[PDB]
Amino acid sequence: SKGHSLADPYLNTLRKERVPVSIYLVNGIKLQGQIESFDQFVILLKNTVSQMVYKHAISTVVPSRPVRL
C-alpha cells in the first residue's frame, strides 16, 4: 500500500526460487530469463546473455508458474 512492501518481496521470492519470468517492456519487447538481482532502479535478468533492465522501462513481470510469499 505504501513503499515497496509488495514489489520487493515479490521480486526476491522470484529471485530466491529461480523462477523463469517474462518481462514486458513499455516498448512491447518481451524478455525472459531469471532474476539475478535487483535494486530500487534496476533488475538483472539472466539468460543466454544477460541484461540489466531499468524498471522505468517495465510494464509487467509475469512469472512462468504461479507464485506466493
Binding site for K ion (CB under 5 A): 8, 17, 67-68
Asked if residue 62 binds a copy of itself (CB under 8 A), the reply is yes
Give the residue with the Cβ less far from K ion, 17 or 29.
Answer: 17
Give the residue with the Cβ less far from a copy of itself, 18 or 26.
Answer: 26
Cα distance between residue 40 and residue 20, in whole Å: 21
Which 29-58 positions form the footprint of a copy of itself (CB under 8 A)?
29, 31, 36-42, 44, 49-58
Which 7-26 positions form the footprint of a copy of itself (CB under 8 A)?
7-8, 10-12, 24-26
Give me the long-range contacts of 50-54 (CB less than 8 A, separation at least 24): 53/23, 53/25
